[PDB]
Design an enzyme around this catalytic site. Structure first.
Site, short mmCIF file in Angstrom:
data_model
loop_
_atom_site.label_atom_id
_atom_site.label_comp_id
_atom_site.label_asym_id
_atom_site.label_seq_id
_atom_site.Cartn_x
_atom_site.Cartn_y
_atom_site.Cartn_z
N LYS A 1 21.14 20.72 40.94
CA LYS A 1 21.43 19.32 41.19
C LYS A 1 22.83 19.14 41.77
O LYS A 1 23.78 19.77 41.34
CB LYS A 1 21.29 18.54 39.89
N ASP B 1 22.38 7.09 28.74
CA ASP B 1 21.56 7.07 29.96
C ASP B 1 20.82 8.38 30.21
O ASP B 1 20.46 8.71 31.35
CB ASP B 1 22.38 6.68 31.20
N1 LIG Z 1 15.81 20.14 34.24
C1 LIG Z 1 14.84 19.57 35.01
N2 LIG Z 1 13.62 20.13 35.15
C2 LIG Z 1 12.65 19.57 35.92
N3 LIG Z 1 12.81 18.42 36.60
C3 LIG Z 1 14.01 17.76 36.56
C4 LIG Z 1 15.10 18.31 35.74
N4 LIG Z 1 16.15 17.47 35.86
C5 LIG Z 1 15.76 16.46 36.68
N5 LIG Z 1 14.48 16.64 37.11
C6 LIG Z 1 13.72 15.74 38.02
O1 LIG Z 1 14.58 14.93 38.82
C7 LIG Z 1 14.50 13.55 38.41
C8 LIG Z 1 15.89 12.94 38.33
O2 LIG Z 1 16.69 13.65 37.37
P1 LIG Z 1 18.12 13.08 36.90
O3 LIG Z 1 19.04 14.22 36.49
O4 LIG Z 1 17.90 11.94 35.95
O5 LIG Z 1 18.67 12.57 38.34
P2 LIG Z 1 19.77 11.40 38.52
O6 LIG Z 1 20.08 11.36 39.99
O7 LIG Z 1 20.90 11.65 37.56
N6 LIG Z 1 18.86 9.98 38.04
P3 LIG Z 1 19.52 8.57 37.26
O8 LIG Z 1 18.93 8.50 35.86
O9 LIG Z 1 19.04 7.45 38.17
O10 LIG Z 1 21.02 8.76 37.26
C9 LIG Z 1 13.78 13.58 37.06
O11 LIG Z 1 13.02 12.40 36.78
C10 LIG Z 1 12.89 14.79 37.19
O12 LIG Z 1 11.69 14.48 37.90
MN LIG Z 2 18.22 10.29 34.93
MN LIG Z 3 21.97 10.55 36.25
#
Ligand SMILES: Nc1ncnc2c1ncn2[C@@H]1O[C@H](COP(=O)(O)OP(=O)(O)NP(=O)(O)O)[C@@H](O)[C@H]1O
Ligand SMILES: [Mn+2]
Ligand SMILES: [Mn+2]
Ligand SMILES: Nc1ncnc2c1ncn2[C@@H]1O[C@H](COP(=O)(O)OP(=O)(O)NP(=O)(O)O)[C@@H](O)[C@H]1O
Ligand SMILES: [Mn+2]
Ligand SMILES: [Mn+2]
Lengths: 307, 307
Positions: free
Chosen positions: B111, B239
């Site tokens: 990420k 969150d």
């Molecule tokens: N460890 C993981 N394994 C599998 N899928 C993942 C994982 N982390 C994130 N995802 C996928 O990516 C999406 C977004 O993850 P997240 O880390 O919440 O992103 P973000 O950009 O921080 N979203 P937000 O809650 O809007 O800040 C999730 O709903 C999953 O579909």
């Molecule tokens: Mn998230």
């Molecule tokens: Mn997030």
């Protein structure tokens, strides 16, 4: 122990691994002769035991030296092993202005050179490479295998790697450095006190040293030497030597035989030699009344005289 | 193709090889949590096909993440392979502000995060590590495996590597992201149009989704979840979501079985489940009226409700 040595090992290892991923074409392009790769490493509160915390490594013209190594019959994986598996050892003969190391497996010599030497190497590198192509790598000239710049905490040094003139197996008991100088050239009385002394033109004439090689080997050798030295004269280079090492098969006791694809400079004595000998002869140190054209003739006259 | 991706692969490869030479003690020292290693590469007229000509790679707290990887049952050589043997693939679900990649063997998620996220990770890293030690790595928290900064020609990005919540083999057909928010939380009508949509708290309550796990598995899970979320509340984090993936063994047709040492979050359905299912559930996204203490209770109430 020596951090500059550890950076060299680390950098050679890095350099060869990077190239292992490059598509190597049969040809060099002009830009290859102006190319380099630089790495700068900064470790903060990490890995203090293995490496300096802050160092730089620069490889000059990586593609050219990769091309040269293959032309000189050297495989990159082998070269990497020779320089990294265990540390290079410092060695006896030198001329500080300059530190020498030998690879642990005795295949390569690592010499510390000046930035002016680096500049001159760049100046001649294309012509050198073209000369190596023309003779199919069959030459008595030094084999330039890699050139590097190392930085560790204020200290910058430049390094060139070449092929050892001597065997990686057969030990040498006697060593000469010959120029054919009209001006008297001799090892000093403090010099002869060394274990493996670097004897010179006078010591050779004085002690009536003979080299017992047959007529074909002598002619082949001198023919090569002729072309090599003319090339050097053409580049206005001088102050180079013929390095001569003698292996005594008797003193040593593969029973006196060498791999000609590793010990490329080896020449067996002829059948009537007073002693079973193997000679190792090659040109070294090319990078600097007495002018190149004259020096060239002097050098060739003397060498033909002593064979 | 993607040069930032190529730098990541190159850097992870570099990072693991460097550590392979380090003596790894059983303990970390305070300075390990402030440590980093930096590499800056400059290639001039060289190696244009494989790498950007100019790039930087920085690894944060190398010893801490090496320690964590082992604690999470991950071997460095395996981790290196998963991230370097072939390129990571970009993937469906995201929330840009943020790009996601999955390792080619589907074991890890990569990420892209902000510098503020990096700063927060540093802030909590010691407490996180101590929490991981205390629970012997048995936790539903994200597993932080590596954190890096990449520079390619003006563009700087920060990357964190974590364990995939989902199986590296068993495919997932349904996916939920749950918070237990008092405020209405639903996937949009444009969202549900996605192939593997990220459904939310309302979709789960709406479509009467059930999770058929036996009483022991449920209690074990919730006990873990309780400790994890309290730790998060203690750090004033919120969150975060419970990510829920469902593998349908019927739709897929090892015949429906998983390696619990790789797919660490897997829980088989109980014997009376309407369908042969495997669930994959874990906490994700921890790095950012509604306060952490309340959020913690809300989250736990909802999750216990849905199991
Ligand atoms: N460890 C993981 N394994 C599998 N899928 C993942 C994982 N982390 C994130 N995802 C996928 O990516 C999406 C977004 O993850 P997240 O880390 O919440 O992103 P973000 O950009 O921080 N979203 P937000 O809650 O809007 O800040 C999730 O709903 C999953 O579909
Ligand atoms: Mn998230
Ligand atoms: Mn997030
Ligand atoms: N390729 C080689 N193989 C084996 N020994 C070598 C080699 N090159 C140099 N040496 C040894 O190191 C000594 C010095 O080599 P050289 O390259 O002439 O050093 P230098 O510092 O340039 N000497 P100078 O002629 O005073 O400038 C030689 O006499 C040899 O004993
Ligand atoms: Mn010399
Ligand atoms: Mn010299």
């Amino acid at each position: 122990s020596d951090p500059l040595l550890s950076v060299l090992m680390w950098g050679v290892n890095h350099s060869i691994n990077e190239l292992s991923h490059v598509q190597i074409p049969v040809m060099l392009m002009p830009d290859d002769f102006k190319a380099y790769s630089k790495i700068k490493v900064d470790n903060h509160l990490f890995n203090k035991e293995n490496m300096p915390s802050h160092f730089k490594f620069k490889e000059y013209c990586p593609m050219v030296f990769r091309n040269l190594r293959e032309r000189f019959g050297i495989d990159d994986q082998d070269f990497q092993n020779s320089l990294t598996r265990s540390a290079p050892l410092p060695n006896d003969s030198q001329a500080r202005s300059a530190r020498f190391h030998t690879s642990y497996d005795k295949r390569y010599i690592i010499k510390t050179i000046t930035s002016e030497d680096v500049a001159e190497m760049h100046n001649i590198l294309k012509k050198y490479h073209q000369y190596i192509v023309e003779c199919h790598g069959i030459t008595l000239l030094p084999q330039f295998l890699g050139m590097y710049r190392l930085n560790v905490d204020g200290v910058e040094i430049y390094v060139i790697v070449t092929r050892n003139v001597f065997s990686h197996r057969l030990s040498v008991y006697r060593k000469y450095d010959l120029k054919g100088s009209t001006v008297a050239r001799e090892a000093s009385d403090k010099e002869k006190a060394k274990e493996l002394p670097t004897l010179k033109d006078n010591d050779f004439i004085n002690e009536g040293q003979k080299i017992y090689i047959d007529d074909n080997n002598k002619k082949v050798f001198l023919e090569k030497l002729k072309k090599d030295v003319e090339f050097l004269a053409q580049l206005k280079l001088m102050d180079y030597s013929l390095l001569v090492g003698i292996h005594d098969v008797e003193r040593a006791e593969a029973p006196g035989e060498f791999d000609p694809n590793i010990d490329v400079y080896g020449i067996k004595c002829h059948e009537n030699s007073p002693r079973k000998e193997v000679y190792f002869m090659a040109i070294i140190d090319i990078l600097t009344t007495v002018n190149p054209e004259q020096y060239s003739k002097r050098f060739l006259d003397f060498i033909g005289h002593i064979l």
